[PDB]
Amino acid sequence: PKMKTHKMAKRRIKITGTGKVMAFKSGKRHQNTGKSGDEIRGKGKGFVLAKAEWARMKLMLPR
Amino acid sequence: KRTKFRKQFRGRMTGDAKGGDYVAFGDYGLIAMEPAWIKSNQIEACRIVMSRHFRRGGKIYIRIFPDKPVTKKPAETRMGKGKGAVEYWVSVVKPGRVMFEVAGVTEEQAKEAFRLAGHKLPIQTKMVKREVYDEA
Amino acid sequence: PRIIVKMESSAGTGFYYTTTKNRRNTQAKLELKKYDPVAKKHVVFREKK
Amino acid sequence: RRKLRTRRKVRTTTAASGRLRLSVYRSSKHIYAQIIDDSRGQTLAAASSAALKSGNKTDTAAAVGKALAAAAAEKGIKQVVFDRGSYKYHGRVKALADAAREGG
Amino acid sequence: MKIKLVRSVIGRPGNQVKTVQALGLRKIGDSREVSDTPAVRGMVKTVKHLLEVQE
Amino acid sequence: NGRDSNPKYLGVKKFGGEVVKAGNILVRQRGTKFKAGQGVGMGRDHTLFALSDGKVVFINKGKGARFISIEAAQ
RNA sequence: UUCUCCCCGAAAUGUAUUGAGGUACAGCCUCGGAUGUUGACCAUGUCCUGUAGAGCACUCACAAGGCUAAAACCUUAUGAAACUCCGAAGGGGCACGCGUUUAGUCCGGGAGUGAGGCUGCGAGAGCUAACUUCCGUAGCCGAGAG
RNA sequence: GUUUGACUGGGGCGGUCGCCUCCCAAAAUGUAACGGAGGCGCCCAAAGGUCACCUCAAGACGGUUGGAAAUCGUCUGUAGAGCGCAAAGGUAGAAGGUGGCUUGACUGCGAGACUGACACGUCGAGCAGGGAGGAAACUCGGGCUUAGUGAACCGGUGGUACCG
Numbered sequence: 001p002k003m004k005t006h007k008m009a010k011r012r013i014k015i016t017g018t019g020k021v022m023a024f025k026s027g028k029r030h031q032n033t034g035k036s037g038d039e040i041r042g043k044g045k046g047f048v049l050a051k052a053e054w055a056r057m058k059l060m061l062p063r
Numbered sequence: 064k065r066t067k068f069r070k071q072f073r074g075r076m077t078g079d080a081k082g083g084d085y086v087a088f089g090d091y092g093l094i095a096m097e098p099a100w101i102k103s104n105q106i107e108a109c110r111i112v113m114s115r116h117f118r119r120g121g122k123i124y125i126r127i128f129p130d131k132p133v134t135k136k137p138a139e140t141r142m143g144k145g146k147g148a149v150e151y152w153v154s155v156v157k158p159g160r161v162m163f164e165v166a167g168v169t170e171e172q173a174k175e176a177f178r179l180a181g182h183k184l185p186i187q188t189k190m191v192k193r194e195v196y197d198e199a
Numbered sequence: 200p201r202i203i204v205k206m207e208s209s210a211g212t213g214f215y216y217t218t219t220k221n222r223r224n225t226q227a228k229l230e231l232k233k234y235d236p237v238a239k240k241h242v243v244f245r246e247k248k
Numbered sequence: 249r250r251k252l253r254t255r256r257k258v259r260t261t262t263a264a265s266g267r268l269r270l271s272v273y274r275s276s277k278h279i280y281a282q283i284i285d286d287s288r289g290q291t292l293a294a295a296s297s298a299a300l301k302s303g304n305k306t307d308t309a310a311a312v313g314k315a316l317a318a319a320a321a322e323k324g325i326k327q328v329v330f331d332r333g334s335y336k337y338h339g340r341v342k343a344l345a346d347a348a349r350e351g352g
Numbered sequence: 353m354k355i356k357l358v359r360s361v362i363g364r365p366g367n368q369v370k371t372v373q374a375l376g377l378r379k380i381g382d383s384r385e386v387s388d389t390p391a392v393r394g395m396v397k398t399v400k401h402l403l404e405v406q407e
Numbered sequence: 408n409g410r411d412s413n414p415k416y417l418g419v420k421k422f423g424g425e426v427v428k429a430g431n432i433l434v435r436q437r438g439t440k441f442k443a444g445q446g447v448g449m450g451r452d453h454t455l456f457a458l459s460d461g462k463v464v465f466i467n468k469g470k471g472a473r474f475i476s477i478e479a480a481q
Numbered sequence: 482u483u484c485u486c487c488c489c490g491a492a493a494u495g496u497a498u499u500g501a502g503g504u505a506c507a508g509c510c511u512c513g514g515a516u517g518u519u520g521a522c523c524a525u526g527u528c529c530u531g532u533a534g535a536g537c538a539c540u541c542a543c544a545a546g547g548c549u550a551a552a553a554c555c556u557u558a559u560g561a562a563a564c565u566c567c568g569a570a571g572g573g574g575c576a577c578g579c580g581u582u583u584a585g586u587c588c589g590g591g592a593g594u595g596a597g598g599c600u601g602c603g604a605g606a607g608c609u610a611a612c613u614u615c616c617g618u619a620g621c622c623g624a625g626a627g
Numbered sequence: 628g629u630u631u632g633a634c635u636g637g638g639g640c641g642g643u644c645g646c647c648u649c650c651c652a653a654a655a656u657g658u659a660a661c662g663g664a665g666g667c668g669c670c671c672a673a674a675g676g677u678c679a680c681c682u683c684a685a686g687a688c689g690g691u692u693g694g695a696a697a698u699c700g701u702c703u704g705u706a707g708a709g710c711g712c713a714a715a716g717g718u719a720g721a722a723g724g725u726g727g728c729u730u731g732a733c734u735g736c737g738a739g740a741c742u743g744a745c746a747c748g749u750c751g752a753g754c755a756g757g758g759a760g761g762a763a764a765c766u767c768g769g770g771c772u773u774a775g776u777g778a779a780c781c782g783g784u785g786g787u788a789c790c791g
């Protein structure tokens with residue numbers, strides 16, 4: 001069998017072509033407003049390093 | 064004896080002393096040869112001995128001074144909270160450092176007074192009259 | 200109790216807010232600043248809320 | 249009176265990158281002006297008014313700016329710094345300016 | 353500038369070991385002929401107690 | 408009365424005679440032990456960073472007042 | 482936790498953990514591919530540092546005199562982890578090789594280790610005690626017979 | 628039916644658990660202890676942008692209330708002050724003290740770097756929209772820096788008009 005873990009689905013992973021793992025930008029994501037303008041602006045990367053193997057096996061087909 | 068001063072506790076190691084190898088005040092001087100702590104009552108016993116032998120006369124200088132706190136843990140506990148708050152004050156003493164020096168007393172009586180005072184110090188020590196001197 | 204609350208400022212007939220902690224000590228009177236909202240250039244945002 | 253001199257002199261040679269210096273001296277009736285290339289230890293285009301005379305100091309100095317604007321104009325002077333000495337951008341040195349770069 | 357090992361690497365610090373290894377010596381009783389250029393002189397100085405420098 | 412402390416790495420990061428690319432950080436410091444030189448910029452925490460690529464170089468005069476600076480290649 | 486010989490060969494560290502004799506990631510091992518001297522040592526050049534020492538110029542402490550409404554201030558004289566007018570030896574980054582050596586890096590499969598121990602040097606805690614304890618550093622044991 | 632933490636020179640009682648500063652820390656960075664000291668969970672519509680101006684502690688002599696220190700005057704005076712809170716670095720060509728106009732305590736971005744196992748965290752030229760102060764060069768995307776903090780989930784509110 002081998003189901004993918006659905007927690008990873010719309011959760012900040014996605015599979016870039018060329019096999020790299022996506023992620024989102026988290027800190028101060030919600031509930032904080034003495035954070036600076038760029039900081040609120042700083043979300044949206046997902047390049048993420050030595051975790052990738054596990055993130056991959058979280059999603060077999062990229063759901 | 065105890066200073067009226069600052070931070071309670073310290074550390075410890077050693078190297079030969081610099082801050083008083085030469086006898087400025089007075090005529091003669093007993094002088095340390097070993098690197099022990101001296102501390103408080105050890106000195107004060109030196110003082111009280113020499114003041115017995117000499118006083119009514121002479122000038123007594125104590126160039127050394129119990130600067131350094133030393134600690135005792137309580138009683139019988141395990142290596143526990145922190146260090147122990149009190150116990151006794153010491154003066155580190157390195158060879159060539161001058162602790163004592165008399166004034167206005169004949170050579171021989173200074174011999175006997177240094178002998179008495181040094182029979183109750185942890186270090187052995189040697190006396191001298193001042194050679195020629197510089198450092199002014 | 201509480202002293203210097205967080206105050207949200209509606210822009211002057213815009214659609215966007217800004218939010219900051221105007222201290223309620225000396226700042227007894229409602230905030231009136233200027234800032235760039237959804238549309239034009241800097242305008243008066245009225246930090247009433 | 250001192251600190252304002254070195255104050256504006258530090259803020260001038262910070263803002264000085266490319267642009268040349270223009271140090272108006274005003275303490276006397278000598279409202280001399282210079283154009284100094286910071287870096288190179290050189291001036292190139294001074295316009296002192298020891299020979300000129302036009303009346304009140306505010307208007308005498310005016311011509312000094314004009315004299316200077318012609319001199320630097322012959323050398324190919326872009327813009328410049330300004331480098332006030334201590335004098336609070338007042339009508340005589342403000343006039344030396346309006347006269348300098350109105351005619352630049 | 354003849355050299356040989358005459359004392360083991362073992363139980364000697366790291367720079368001494370890697371220097372013995374640089375100079376070309378991998379066993380006690382190895383010998384070698386080394387130029388006198390400043391860096392080689394510095395190497396053969398760094399571990400001179402391990403080496404019977406000839407002259 | 409003991410447990411406390413804290414760990415914030417500081418220091419010179421790009422030493423003289425090194426080729427910094429522009430935007431490189433060259434010193435982290437708490438005050439102005441180094442003053443930003445010709446070609447150098449300093450942020451809120453008095454970090455000095457390259458304004459344009461070049462050779463990093465140090466000017467020392469009296470430890471009240473030394474400056475890091477860039478001498479561009481070419 | 483059972484058959485053989487051959488090659489390489491660790492860890493007892495870091496950060497996190499209802500975590501502390503467990504586990505994740507990193508670190509260190511091995512294998513295959515790629516580059517292909519970028520590695521190592523030692524030299525020269527350059528920059529950074531506040532330790533050893535020393536010194537009282539500031540802070541605190543402090544010894545004998547002088548002046549004196551005792552404070553300051555003068556001569557003489559000291560101590561310092563949380564003092565420093567000064568300040569090495571060493572140490573770190575970068576370039577270069579002017580010179581010898583032989584690794585290094587990237588990519589992917591398999592790990593184990595995360596209880597360390599002693600001694601010399603540098604400190605703390607402790608009695609300047611411990612086959613003591615916690616860090617730093619070198620080497621051996623660990624897994625090393627002779 | 629279950630819950631009823633961990634560290635811990637045995638466990639318990641006591642104490643501690645995140646964050647900042649100094650010594651320890653052996654002149655790079657890093658470095659443990661129920662080692663030695665001390666602070667934070669904020670504050671400020673001005674203590675911020677900018678633009679203009681001023682310069683401190685302390686002592687001596689002289690002077691109304693005073694009577695060692697108040698206020699005023701001359702002299703000396705790298706700082707012996709000040710910097711909202713701790714300490715350290717820094718600081719007088721100010722970051723200190725005062726006034727003017729003001730909000731850049733911005734939107735969309737982010738070359739390139741510091742730092743961390745990760746996730747976080749720091750600095751930042753320069754580009755556009757649009758502003759503020761200055762005559763101008765130019766400075767402004769909060770504060771002299773370093774503490775004033777909380778992933779995710781689940782939800783309140785306002786836009787948007789992607790899904791449905």
Ligand SMILES: [Mg+2]
Nearest residue numbers: 001002003004
């Ligand atoms: Mg089936």
Ligand SMILES: [Mg+2]
Nearest residue numbers: 014015016062
């Ligand atoms: Mg996709």
Ligand SMILES: [Mg+2]
Nearest residue numbers: 076077078079
């Ligand atoms: Mg010694």
Ligand SMILES: [Mg+2]
Nearest residue numbers: 077078079080
């Ligand atoms: Mg010795």
Ligand SMILES: [Mg+2]
Nearest residue numbers: 081082083198
């Ligand atoms: Mg001396």
Ligand SMILES: [Mg+2]
Nearest residue numbers: 363364365620
């Ligand atoms: Mg030996």
Ligand SMILES: [Mg+2]
Nearest residue numbers: 488489490624
């Ligand atoms: Mg082998």
Ligand SMILES: [Mg+2]
Nearest residue numbers: 496497743747
């Ligand atoms: Mg952590």
Ligand SMILES: [Mg+2]
Nearest residue numbers: 501502503595
């Ligand atoms: Mg464990």
Ligand SMILES: [Mg+2]
Nearest residue numbers: 505506507592
């Ligand atoms: Mg692993």
Ligand SMILES: [Mg+2]
Nearest residue numbers: 511512513514
């Ligand atoms: Mg390989």
Ligand SMILES: [Mg+2]
Nearest residue numbers: 519520585586
């Ligand atoms: Mg390399």
Ligand SMILES: [Mg+2]
Nearest residue numbers: 518519520578
């Ligand atoms: Mg090489």
Ligand SMILES: [Mg+2]
Nearest residue numbers: 078533534535
């Ligand atoms: Mg010392």
Ligand SMILES: [Mg+2]
Nearest residue numbers: 536538566567
């Ligand atoms: Mg000198």
Ligand SMILES: [Mg+2]
Nearest residue numbers: 518578580581
């Ligand atoms: Mg080569």
